[PDB]
Amino acid sequence: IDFPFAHEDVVQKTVDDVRTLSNMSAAADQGVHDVNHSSKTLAERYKDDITALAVLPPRVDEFAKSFNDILWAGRTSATHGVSRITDFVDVTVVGIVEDIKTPEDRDEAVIELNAIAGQKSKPVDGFPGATRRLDGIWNTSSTDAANIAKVLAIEKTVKELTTAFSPAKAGYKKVQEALRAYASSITKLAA
Amino acid sequence: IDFPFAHEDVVQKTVDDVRTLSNMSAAADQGVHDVNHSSKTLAERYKDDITALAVLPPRVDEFAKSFNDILWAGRTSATHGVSRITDFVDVTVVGIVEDIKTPEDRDEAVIELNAIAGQKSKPVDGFPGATRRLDGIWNTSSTDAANIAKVLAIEKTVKELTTAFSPAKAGYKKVQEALRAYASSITKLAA
Numbered sequence: 001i002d003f004p005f006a007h008e009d010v011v012q013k014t015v016d017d018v019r020t021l022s023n024m025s026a027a028a029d030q031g032v033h034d035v036n037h038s039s040k041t042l043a044e045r046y047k048d049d050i051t052a053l054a055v056l057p058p059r060v061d062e063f064a065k066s067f068n069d070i071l072w073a074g075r076t077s078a079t080h081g082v083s084r085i086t087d088f089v090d091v092t093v094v095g096i097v098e099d100i101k102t103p104e105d106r107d108e109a110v111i112e113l114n115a116i117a118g119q120k121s122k123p124v125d126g127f128p129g130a131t132r133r134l135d136g137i138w139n140t141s142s143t144d145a146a147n148i149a150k151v152l153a154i155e156k157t158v159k160e161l162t163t164a165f166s167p168a169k170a171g172y173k174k175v176q177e178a179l180r181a182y183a184s185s186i187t188k189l190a191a
Numbered sequence: 192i193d194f195p196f197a198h199e200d201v202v203q204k205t206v207d208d209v210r211t212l213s214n215m216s217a218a219a220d221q222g223v224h225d226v227n228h229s230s231k232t233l234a235e236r237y238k239d240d241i242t243a244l245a246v247l248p249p250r251v252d253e254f255a256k257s258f259n260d261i262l263w264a265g266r267t268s269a270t271h272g273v274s275r276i277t278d279f280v281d282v283t284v285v286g287i288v289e290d291i292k293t294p295e296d297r298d299e300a301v302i303e304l305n306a307i308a309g310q311k312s313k314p315v316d317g318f319p320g321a322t323r324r325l326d327g328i329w330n331t332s333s334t335d336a337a338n339i340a341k342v343l344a345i346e347k348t349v350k351e352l353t354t355a356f357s358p359a360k361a362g363y364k365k366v367q368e369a370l371r372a373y374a375s376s377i378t379k380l381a382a
């Protein structure tokens with residue numbers, strides 16, 4: 001029963017991944033706006049004499065807005081990533097799997113981990129960088145849920161489960177905060 | 192009988208006009224290519240991760256090529272401007288009006304000045320800066336031709352004409368060389 005985020009080396013690699021995804025989005029968005037700004041200033045610089053230069057900024061602006069939508073599609077996937085980790089770690093694992101009592105309780109536990117492992121993610125169209133690193137994190141949860149759920153079918157196994165998953169929690173919260181900061185940053189980009 | 196290019200102040204204002212037209216074309220073309228270059232490098236910088244960024248350079252490139260055509264339409268008008276001055280000053284004035292002999296000769300002179308005054312210019316679509324400064328020079332010839340042609344209908348008037356137009360010749364050649372250099376520069380821009 002390995003938990004990829006129970007190891008500090010994996011957690012850092014994953015936090016970097018998200019940082020890299022956040023920073024890239026910032027850099028690229030600026031790059032697009034600098035191009036867009038530069039385009040506008042140029043047409044303004046020769047607006048009296050060169051009338052055709054006005055045709056360009058609108059073309060660069062229509063793209064800039066398409067680009068912003070993709071960046072916000074990325075944000076949306078990141079927030080669902082934050083939600084997902086809360087539902088796995090806090091609602092399911094700590095809420096149910098650590099507080100297991102009755103058949104009717106674990107009836108929730110093993111199912112609720114199954115519903116989690118069965119969930120998939122909308123990819124970010126035109127942003128395969130975001131799709132790849134986000135799916136990688138989404139799927140760590142799916143795999144950890146599955147593993148945990150297979151290791152039922154009691155009270156002995158649960159104390160081992162709790163103890164074994166414990167090192168993963170700080171890992172998960174580390175990754176959740178990275179995603180949460182990436183999602184926050186996107187909202188602030190247009191400023 | 193004033194000749195606008197017989198005065199050193201007007202000739203300079205006109206040479207500047209053309210210089211301003213040459214330099215602007217250079218500056219703006221570079222401005223468009225810098226934007227275009229910057230657009231391409233940006234998509235290259237994030238080609239693995241951000242697939243949608245590739246949509247932009249093609250849009251900026253289609254414009255860049257439209258822009259080059261306008262700059263070359265400007266060149267074409269400038270070269271016709273050079274040709275025009277040669278036909279007025281060197282072929283007509285010095286070729287015919289200074290060498291006037293017979294009725295059949297001046298039959299050419301007054302007509303040939305009339306055909307000149309009757310010629311008009313194709314404007315440079317999307318480049319009203321170029322249209323304005325080029326038409327201004329085109330029309331100085333048209334007006335000077337007309338004036339000269341009205342001041343027939345002999346051998347007395349011709350020596351006054353010759354002498355009076357003389358200060359204009361250096362003016363014209365000054366303007367022709369400016370236009371000739373502007374036309375030359377355009378051919379070299381894409382490099």
Ligand code: NA
Nearest residue numbers: 003004005168
């Ligand atoms: Na894990």
Ligand code: NA
Nearest residue numbers: 194195196359
């Ligand atoms: Na003149």
